[PDB]
Design an enzyme around this catalytic site. Structure first.
Site, PDB file in Angstrom:
ATOM      1  N   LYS A   5     -32.778  -1.914  17.015  1.00 12.96           N
ATOM      2  CA  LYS A   5     -32.949  -2.580  18.304  1.00 12.96           C
ATOM      3  C   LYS A   5     -32.290  -1.787  19.433  1.00 12.96           C
ATOM      4  CE  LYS A   5     -29.154  -5.938  17.437  1.00 12.96           C
ATOM      5  NZ  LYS A   5     -28.816  -7.388  17.413  1.00 12.96           N
ATOM      6  N   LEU A  11     -33.920  -4.538   7.634  1.00 17.17           N
ATOM      7  CA  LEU A  11     -35.329  -4.735   7.957  1.00 17.17           C
ATOM      8  C   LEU A  11     -35.864  -6.005   7.299  1.00 17.17           C
ATOM      9  CD1 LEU A  11     -37.972  -3.725   9.246  1.00 17.17           C
ATOM     10  CD2 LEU A  11     -38.311  -2.251   7.207  1.00 17.17           C
ATOM     11  N   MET A  12     -36.548  -6.837   8.085  1.00 17.43           N
ATOM     12  CA  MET A  12     -37.190  -8.037   7.569  1.00 17.43           C
ATOM     13  C   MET A  12     -38.700  -7.880   7.718  1.00 17.43           C
ATOM     14  SD  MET A  12     -34.593  -9.787   6.525  1.00 17.43           S
ATOM     15  CE  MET A  12     -35.034 -11.524   6.486  1.00 17.43           C
ATOM     16  N   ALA A  13     -39.339  -7.499   6.618  1.00 16.63           N
ATOM     17  CA  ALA A  13     -40.707  -6.977   6.643  1.00 16.63           C
ATOM     18  C   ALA A  13     -41.778  -7.913   7.202  1.00 16.63           C
ATOM     19  CB  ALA A  13     -41.100  -6.501   5.245  1.00 16.63           C
ATOM     20  N   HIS A  14     -41.529  -9.222   7.162  1.00 17.69           N
ATOM     21  CA  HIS A  14     -42.465 -10.203   7.692  1.00 17.69           C
ATOM     22  C   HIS A  14     -42.015 -10.819   9.011  1.00 17.69           C
ATOM     23  CE1 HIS A  14     -45.301  -9.907   4.447  1.00 17.69           C
ATOM     24  NE2 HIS A  14     -44.302  -9.928   3.585  1.00 17.69           N
ATOM     25  N   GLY A  15     -40.998 -10.205   9.608  1.00 22.54           N
ATOM     26  CA  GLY A  15     -40.606 -10.538  10.963  1.00 22.54           C
ATOM     27  C   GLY A  15     -40.033 -11.927  11.102  1.00 22.54           C
ATOM     28  N   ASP A  16     -40.200 -12.515  12.282  1.00 23.97           N
ATOM     29  CA  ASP A  16     -39.577 -13.813  12.540  1.00 23.97           C
ATOM     30  C   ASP A  16     -40.450 -14.921  11.972  1.00 23.97           C
ATOM     31  OD1 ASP A  16     -40.930 -15.614  14.803  1.00 23.97           O
ATOM     32  OD2 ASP A  16     -41.204 -13.525  15.382  1.00 23.97           O
ATOM     33  N   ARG A  23     -38.187 -19.239  15.101  1.00 27.12           N
ATOM     34  CA  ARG A  23     -38.233 -17.919  15.750  1.00 27.12           C
ATOM     35  C   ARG A  23     -36.944 -17.118  15.526  1.00 27.12           C
ATOM     36  NH1 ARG A  23     -37.554 -21.709  19.569  1.00 27.12           N
ATOM     37  NH2 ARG A  23     -35.401 -21.641  20.352  1.00 27.12           N
ATOM     38  N   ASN A  24     -35.850 -17.804  15.188  1.00 24.28           N
ATOM     39  CA  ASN A  24     -34.562 -17.147  14.945  1.00 24.28           C
ATOM     40  C   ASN A  24     -34.179 -17.126  13.467  1.00 24.28           C
ATOM     41  OD1 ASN A  24     -34.201 -16.400  17.661  1.00 24.28           O
ATOM     42  ND2 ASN A  24     -33.381 -18.427  18.152  1.00 24.28           N
ATOM     43  N   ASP A  61     -31.497 -11.861  12.884  1.00 17.23           N
ATOM     44  CA  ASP A  61     -30.700 -11.102  13.863  1.00 17.23           C
ATOM     45  C   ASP A  61     -30.520 -11.983  15.120  1.00 17.23           C
ATOM     46  OD1 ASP A  61     -29.501  -9.078  15.372  1.00 17.23           O
ATOM     47  OD2 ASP A  61     -31.315  -7.847  15.454  1.00 17.23           O
TER      48      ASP A  61
HETATM   49  O1  LIG Z   1     -33.821  -7.599  15.085  1.00 14.96           O
HETATM   50  C1  LIG Z   1     -34.215  -7.376  13.701  1.00 14.96           C
HETATM   51  N1  LIG Z   1     -33.320  -7.168  12.725  1.00 14.96           N
HETATM   52  N2  LIG Z   1     -34.084  -6.981  11.552  1.00 14.96           N
HETATM   53  C2  LIG Z   1     -35.404  -7.104  11.787  1.00 14.96           C
HETATM   54  N3  LIG Z   1     -36.490  -7.002  11.002  1.00 14.96           N
HETATM   55  N4  LIG Z   1     -37.745  -7.177  11.573  1.00 14.96           N
HETATM   56  C3  LIG Z   1     -37.923  -7.423  12.894  1.00 14.96           C
HETATM   57  C4  LIG Z   1     -39.320  -7.599  13.333  1.00 14.96           C
HETATM   58  C5  LIG Z   1     -39.850  -8.148  14.614  1.00 14.96           C
HETATM   59  C6  LIG Z   1     -39.115  -8.632  15.804  1.00 14.96           C
HETATM   60  C7  LIG Z   1     -38.509  -9.885  15.747  1.00 14.96           C
HETATM   61  C8  LIG Z   1     -37.833 -10.368  16.868  1.00 14.96           C
HETATM   62  C9  LIG Z   1     -37.818  -9.598  18.047  1.00 14.96           C
HETATM   63  C10 LIG Z   1     -38.435  -8.354  18.088  1.00 14.96           C
HETATM   64  C11 LIG Z   1     -39.093  -7.863  16.961  1.00 14.96           C
HETATM   65  N5  LIG Z   1     -41.203  -8.143  14.540  1.00 14.96           N
HETATM   66  N6  LIG Z   1     -41.531  -7.638  13.289  1.00 14.96           N
HETATM   67  C12 LIG Z   1     -42.802  -7.491  12.871  1.00 14.96           C
HETATM   68  C13 LIG Z   1     -43.040  -6.990  11.592  1.00 14.96           C
HETATM   69  C14 LIG Z   1     -41.974  -6.632  10.757  1.00 14.96           C
HETATM   70  C15 LIG Z   1     -40.673  -6.790  11.231  1.00 14.96           C
HETATM   71  C16 LIG Z   1     -40.511  -7.321  12.508  1.00 14.96           C
HETATM   72  C17 LIG Z   1     -36.852  -7.526  13.783  1.00 14.96           C
HETATM   73  C18 LIG Z   1     -35.598  -7.357  13.221  1.00 14.96           C
END
Ligand SMILES: O=C1N=Nc2nnc(-c3c(-c4ccccc4)nn4ccccc34)cc21
Length: 301
Positions: free
Chosen positions: A49, A97-102, A155-156, A169
């Protein structure tokens, strides 16, 4: 406005930015590769970030200080901070890293009509209980450290490569989900649709109001992350909840999950359960790995 480099500082040379993941409220988040950041791993897939390049030096300090809040934390169910690059430019913070995002974005992708539907059906009851326990365990850990989250919401939370859900995060979604926040001068951005009545009324955040929000996360899981109180305005929501309102269960909501929400939304905050109590209620209905990794089952608890 000071940031002193510490043992979390990592050489910029170890970090390679590979692709955009998405815009955090303070700057772009990337997927990257990090060399020798985790002991025992030659290389690690990470998220990194940044600040917007329009940011002042003081804003970069504030960014790093806000990120550093996570340094003390070591929990399987909270996203881990891995390193910081404060020397030179651009300012970086390296995260697990969180592969599937939020989880909000993730849940929305599971709607049958979603353009980005991954082919996975909506969560089963067993999957919802597993998610609930993971979220509650991360929260139990944080609350045990006297940390009040203040912004618990789907979302968090974030979703890992193995579909584990974790407390995300911290403070990363104020841009992508800006409409989830009501700015109230003096109080900043308020996630009013997630907030407990006493937080709305008195500006008070406690572990008991984190529990209120946990109830709303369960609601998002069972609604695939609809907006809570859709079609009420921010000011209407604030009054509705202060006056004793709370969310109606989504259609086809499993009874066990409904009952959890009802406990979370008791008006008197002293009457709400603790996060440990939530994990205790769910413990016999989880993956075999849970006691190996949880805060709940740890000697630390
Ligand atoms: O801020 C992070 N710390 N670890 C993470 N892993 N992943 C994401 C992330 C985000 C993301 C989440 C929140 C804000 C900005 C980006 N999108 N995403 C899409 C596909 C895979 C991963 C992600 C963001 C973070």
């Amino acid at each position: 406005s000071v940031y002193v480099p510490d043992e979390w500082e990592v050489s910029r040379e170890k970090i390679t930015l590979l692709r955009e993941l998405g815009q955090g409220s303070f700057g772009m988040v990337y997927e990257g590769n990090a060399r020798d950041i985790i002991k025992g791993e030659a290389e690690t897939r990470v998220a990194v970030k940044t600040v917007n390049e329009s940011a002042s030096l003081r804003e970069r300090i504030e960014f790093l200080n806000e990120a550093s809040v996570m340094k003390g934390f070591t929990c399987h169910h909270v996203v881990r901070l891995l390193g910081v690059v404060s020397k030179g430019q651009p300012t970086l913070v390296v995260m697990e890293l969180m592969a599937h995002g939020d989880l909000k974005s993730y849940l929305r992708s599971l709607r049958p009509e979603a353009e980005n539907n991954p082919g996975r059906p909506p969560p089963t009851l067993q999957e919802m209980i597993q998610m609930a326990a993971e979220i509650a365990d991360g929260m139990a850990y944080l609350n045990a450290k006297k940390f009040v989250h203040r912004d618990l919401a789907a979302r968090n939370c974030m979703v890992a490569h193995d579909f584990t859900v974790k407390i995300g995060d911290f403070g990363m979604t104020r841009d992508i989900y800006e409409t989830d926040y009501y700015r109230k001068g003096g109080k900043g951005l308020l996630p009013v649709r997630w907030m407990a009545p006493e937080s709305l009324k008195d500006g008070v955040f406690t572990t008991s109001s984190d529990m209120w929000s946990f109830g709303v996360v369960l609601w998002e899981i069972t609604s695939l992350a609809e907006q809570p109180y859709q079609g009420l305005s921010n000011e209407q929501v604030l009054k509705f909840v202060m006056d004793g309102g709370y969310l109606d269960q989504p259609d086809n909501c499993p009874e066990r999950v409904t009952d959890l929400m009802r406990m979370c939304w008791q008006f008197n905050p002293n009457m709400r359960p603790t996060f440990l109590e939530i994990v205790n209620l769910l413990k016999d209905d989880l993956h075999p790995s849970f006691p190996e990794v949880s805060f709940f089952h740890s000697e630390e608890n």
